[PDB]
């Protein structure tokens, strides 16, 4: 089982850069995994923000968050970081880091899903 834990500051001033970390336990960040960053606004639905591939390093971002969202990996420390520039009051939300993958153990195959507890980030001056 892959365990994901979110961390970062609880408050970020407006127009600053929000930095978040997600630490992975039980699996290697450099493996053939996709790590996805999603957020949920208060009293609203979820909104996928982006994701990164552990092996090649290619990153795919939502068009709405393009130009301000960055996702990076760290295999030596075994965690992946997220940066969001020019955060405004509308960016207050609960952020989650998740991953989905097929495990093909010889004869058998199984779909595995993992999410983190999530971290609440409030943007205000």
């Amino acid at each position: 089982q892959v365990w994901l834990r979110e961390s970062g500051p609880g408050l970020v001033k407006s127009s600053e850069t929000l930095s978040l970390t997600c630490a992975v336990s039980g699996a290697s960040v450099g493996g053939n995994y996709y790590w996805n960053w999603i957020r949920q606004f208060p009293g609203k639905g979820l909104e996928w923000m982006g994701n990164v591939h552990g092996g090649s390093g290619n990153t795919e971002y939502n068009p709405s968050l393009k130009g301000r969202l960055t996702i990076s990996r760290d295999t030596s420390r075994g965690h992946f970081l997220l940066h969001l520039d020019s955060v405004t009051a509308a960016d207050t939300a609960v952020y989650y880091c998740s991953t989905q993958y097929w495990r093909h153990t010889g004869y058998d195959s199984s779909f595995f899903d993992s999410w983190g507890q999530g971290a609440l980030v409030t943007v205000s001056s």
Binding site: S28, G30, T75, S76
Partner: protein, 130 residues
């Protein structure tokens, strides 16, 4: 009983000494590992001796300690495997006793070593890519 030196140059002379003393004569043991009713026995013996040596060399080379007699690695020592201190291992025990004590937890260390070596190779390639 203290302050006496012991040096062994035999094949298995250091079998009865401590681990620290016995770790200084690895080469003498390393040399020997390779070298009608009776000819077939000789041939089978030669084949088996070659096979075991090749298996050992492959296992050593997979972990990244190829061409080395002493090689420490990145894998931490899990405290569940043992709890003694270095003073009571390298100066109060023999290799036979240590092997008898640790034989239950051999394969896990091998798998961890292989995975760590593969990850290190991938990281080295990524670093050299730049």
């Amino acid at each position: 009983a203290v302050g006496i030196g012991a040096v062994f140059l035999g094949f298995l002379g250091a079998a009865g000494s401590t681990m620290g003393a016995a770790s200084m004569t690895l080469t003498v043991q390393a040399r020997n590992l390779l070298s009608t009713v009776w000819g077939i026995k000789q041939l089978q013996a030669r084949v088996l001796a070659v096979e075991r040596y090749l298996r050992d060399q492959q296992l050593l080379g997979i972990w990244g300690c190829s061409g080395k007699l002493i090689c420490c690695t990145n894998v931490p020592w899990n405290s569940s495997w043992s709890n003694r201190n270095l003073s009571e291992i390298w100066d109060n025990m023999t290799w036979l006793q240590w092997d008898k004590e640790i034989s239950n937890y051999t394969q896990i260390i091998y798998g961890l070593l292989e995975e760590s070596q593969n990850q290190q190779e991938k990281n080295e390639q990524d670093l050299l890519a730049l």
